[PDB]
Design a protein around this ligand. Structure first.
Ligand SMILES: CC(C)[C@H](C(=O)O)N(CCNC(=O)c1cccc(C(=O)NCCN([C@@H](C(=O)O)C(C)C)S(=O)(=O)c2ccc(-c3ccccc3)cc2)c1)S(=O)(=O)c1ccc(-c2ccccc2)cc1
Ligand SMILES: [Ca+2]
Ligand SMILES: [Ca+2]
Ligand SMILES: [Ca+2]
Ligand SMILES: [Ca+2]
Ligand SMILES: [Ca+2]
Ligand SMILES: [Ca+2]
Ligand SMILES: [Zn+2]
Ligand SMILES: [Zn+2]
Ligand SMILES: [Zn+2]
Ligand SMILES: [Zn+2]
Lengths: 160, 160
């Protein structure tokens, strides 16, 4: 509630600028697609993968300094970040490639879960006080449906 | 916090209820004393160690669910928590003993710097937006003085 920053059109586009070596390109594309699908279902927004610098949400993996002014910190600590909606850097989502990206139970962080969390930020969502919620600021691996009442109440407040 | 929760007396008392086995008791006593020393310089408050359950700030090391419905999660993730000022549970500071507590550069998390962050919450400070600030909610080890302008502006907003 320093805003509320939101997108001002429904058909949001995204560009996967570059890839991590941790997973196959196809797997990465799918993790990101699944992560948008979670928000797609609960909002009037649609997400279209495009191959253009002019996409609303540009996705990159970057280690340390990746030229937006906000260095990653090597392994652990900061996992990723996303800028709230608006023009340019705003809306973009950056994943620290000093982390080990994976999917499923085990090593590293689920690219899916972390992307779903970053994309909530890329839609204008802040952190939730609810510990189970996707937008709670602490990563916990879960096999369960990632969205909870508080996440859905949050986007509904913005787009609903 | 909610309505700027703050203490309404100047002589704040604390009780170290139990001890982690990670460090000598004497080192633990001194780590916590130093953490209070940092907030006493910039505030009207003084902190007196007492040996009573009626202390304002009760300090304890615990694991998982530990009595307050706000459970810890084993090694890593959540490090500690403290409650804003007020009666009973309010003001108290809990340290996850599934973490390794240490001092200096190396293993584990510095009890001194974590205590200092927790005690700022136990005085009524919320999280800071400024990544260097002691009240920034990401642990980074540092040898430099812990307080930054944002922390001290925060405490002065509460206690003048
Ligand atoms: C803003 C970004 C750069 C980014 C993000 O959230 O997008 N990240 C920043 C996150 N940090 C925060 O912005 C933040 C904001 C508000 C609150 C919090 C927070 O409350 N964390 C818990 C704080 N802890 C306690 C406390 O601070 O007293 C307490 C409230 C439980 S703590 O135990 O974790 C803790 C304690 C002490 C300290 C400490 C700090 C300084 C000195 C000494 C100690 C730090 C943390 C964290 S991140 O770390 O790379 C990240 C984290 C989680 C996810 C995620 C992925 C999938 C599913 C769910 C989550 C993705 C990315
Ligand atoms: Ca953008
Ligand atoms: Ca990192
Ligand atoms: Ca990686
Ligand atoms: Ca923990
Ligand atoms: Ca108390
Ligand atoms: Ca321990
Ligand atoms: Zn970035
Ligand atoms: Zn977040
Ligand atoms: Zn507790
Ligand atoms: Zn904190």
């Amino acid at each position: 509630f320093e805003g509320d920053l939101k997108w001002h059109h429904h058909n949001i586009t995204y560009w996967i600028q570059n890839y991590s070596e941790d997973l196959p390109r196809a797997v990465i594309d799918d993790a990101f697609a699944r992560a948008f699908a979670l928000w797609s279902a609960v909002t009037p927004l649609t997400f279209t993968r495009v191959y253009s610098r002019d996409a609303d949400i540009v996705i990159q993996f970057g280690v340390a300094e990746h030229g937006d002014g906000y260095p990653f910190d090597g392994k652990d600590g900061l996992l990723a970040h996303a800028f709230p909606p608006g023009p340019g850097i705003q809306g973009d989502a950056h994943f620290d490639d000093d982390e080990l990206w994976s999917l499923g139970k085990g090593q590293g962080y689920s690219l899916f879960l972390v992307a779903a969390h970053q994309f909530g930020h890329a839609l204008g969502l802040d952190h939730s006080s609810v510990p189970e919620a996707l937008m709670y600021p602490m990563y916990r691996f879960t096999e369960g449906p990632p969205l909870h009442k508080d996440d859905v109440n949050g986007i509904r407040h913005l787009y609903g």
